[PDB]
């Protein structure tokens, strides 16, 4: 919740999948404000330099929820940052 290390990889993947499907069932402005919250939360806990770019402008091969998670995992490992909860 507060940090990335509070997430297991599966739990974090659950959030990322919401950027591809309507998990919440919300529509219109309410859906947008939820996705707004998820985006800024994503940027906050991952501390990734490309921010939401990881999700909305992914590198080739990393366009899927699995790829997004893997990009986060790889970047944080490369920067000596704590990874996901085990596991």
């Amino acid at each position: 919740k507060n940090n990335l290390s509070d997430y297991t990889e599966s739990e974090f993947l659950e959030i990322i999948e919401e950027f591809f499907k309507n998990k919440s069932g919300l529509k219109g402005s309410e859906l947008e404000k939820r996705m707004d919250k998820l985006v800024k939360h994503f940027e906050e806990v991952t501390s990734h330099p490309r921010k939401s770019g990881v999700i909305f402008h992914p590198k080739p091969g990393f366009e899927t929820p699995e790829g997004i998670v893997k990009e986060v995992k790889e970047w944080r490992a490369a920067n000596g940052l704590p990874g996901f909860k085990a596991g």
Partner: protein, 128 residues
């Protein structure tokens, strides 16, 4: 304030959303205008939702969007621009009126609408 959309837009195809980060924005594609022209909208929020949903039915736009941005526009949500075109916490592509209502542009005039990145929008404002 409810209204009726008018305008023909402008006929260009390809990565039309690439022009959103340049100049004074990219005008609304004609094939997008076709889906909006002659329709009634209860509010601007209503029009904004319908606009992106129309973008979601356009192959020329879809092909140049990530799978994530494709889902968003399919839900009537504004797509996100590249990080390079962000402005702090402002990240979404934005619909903007070229001339404001008091100068005196029309609210639902498609020919008065352009798409801009948050970064380009600030640069436009500075040039005024």
């Amino acid at each position: 304030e409810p209204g009726v959309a008018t305008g023909n837009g402008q006929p260009v195809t390809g990565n039309w959303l690439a022009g959103a980060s340049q100049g004074d924005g990219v005008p609304i594609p004609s094939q997008i205008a076709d889906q909006l022209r002659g329709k009634e909208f209860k509010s601007w929020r209503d029009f904004r939702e319908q606009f992106w949903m129309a973008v979601s039915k356009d192959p020329s736009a879809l092909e140049n969007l990530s799978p994530s941005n494709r889902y968003f526009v399919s839900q009537g949500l504004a797509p996100y621009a590249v990080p390079e075109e962000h402005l702090g916490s402002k990240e979404k592509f934005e619909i903007h009126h070229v001339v404001p209502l008091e100068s005196g542009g029309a609210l639902y005039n498609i020919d008065n609408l352009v798409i801009v990145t948050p970064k380009r929008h600030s640069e436009i404002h500075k040039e005024l």
